[PDB]
Amino acid sequence: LMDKNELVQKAKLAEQAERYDDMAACMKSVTEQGAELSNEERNLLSVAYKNVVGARRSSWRVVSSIEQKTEGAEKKQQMAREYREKIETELRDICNDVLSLLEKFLIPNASQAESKVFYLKMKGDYYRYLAEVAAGDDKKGIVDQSQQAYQEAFEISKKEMQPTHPIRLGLALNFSVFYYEILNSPEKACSLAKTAFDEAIAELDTLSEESYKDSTLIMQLLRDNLTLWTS
C-alpha cells in the first residue's frame, strides 16, 4: 500500500463502487506522499472529498431545518440540536482534513498557475463549507479565510487564464455564491457572475475541442444563479 499508482487504481475503483470514504482515503495517501498530483489525480481527490463532505452537508441541512421547524416542542428540538451538533463535528473534521492537505502539500507544490488557482478556490470552498456551519466566535475568521483564498485565485485567474477556462468560470461561480450565500451581498454576487459570463461569451474564439462542453456548462450555471438571485 506504498505504491503510488496502485492507490490511484484503488481510488478509481472505490469511485465506481460509490464508496467515497474509501476513495478519499486513497487520494489522501497519494497526496501525503509529497507528490504534486496529476490532473487526473487531482480530479479523483476532488470528487472523493466533494461526495464525502457533500453528504454531511446534505444531512446538516435536513436536521438543521427540522430543529428550526421544531420551535415549541422542547424534546424534539433538543434532540434535533444534539444530532445537528453531531453531524457538524463530522463536517468540521472532514474540512480540517482537506484544508490540512491544501496547506501542507497541494498549495505548496503547485508549479503551474492552472493548479494554483484550482487549489485556492478549493481552499475558499472548504472554508465556506465551514462558514455554512460556523456560529458566533469563530465564524468571523472562518469567513475571512475563505474570502482571502478566493480573492488570490481570482486575481491569479484574471491574469494568467482565458475567461472561458472552466477553472476560471468555476471560480467565478463559487465566488459569486460566497458573496450571495455567506456575505449576504447580492449585488456584488450578481456583478461577479454577470461579468464572468459576459467576458466569456465575448471571447468564445478561445474554446477548446476538449473543454467547450465543460465551460459551456458553467456559463449556464452562472446565468442560472443569476436568474435565481434576481427574484
Partner: peptide, 10 residues
C-alpha cells in the same frame, strides 16, 4: 431552489 457550485470535474 438553491445556489449551484462546481469543482469543475474536467
Amino acid at each position: 431552489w438553491r445556489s449551484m457550485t462546481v469543482v469543475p470535474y474536467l
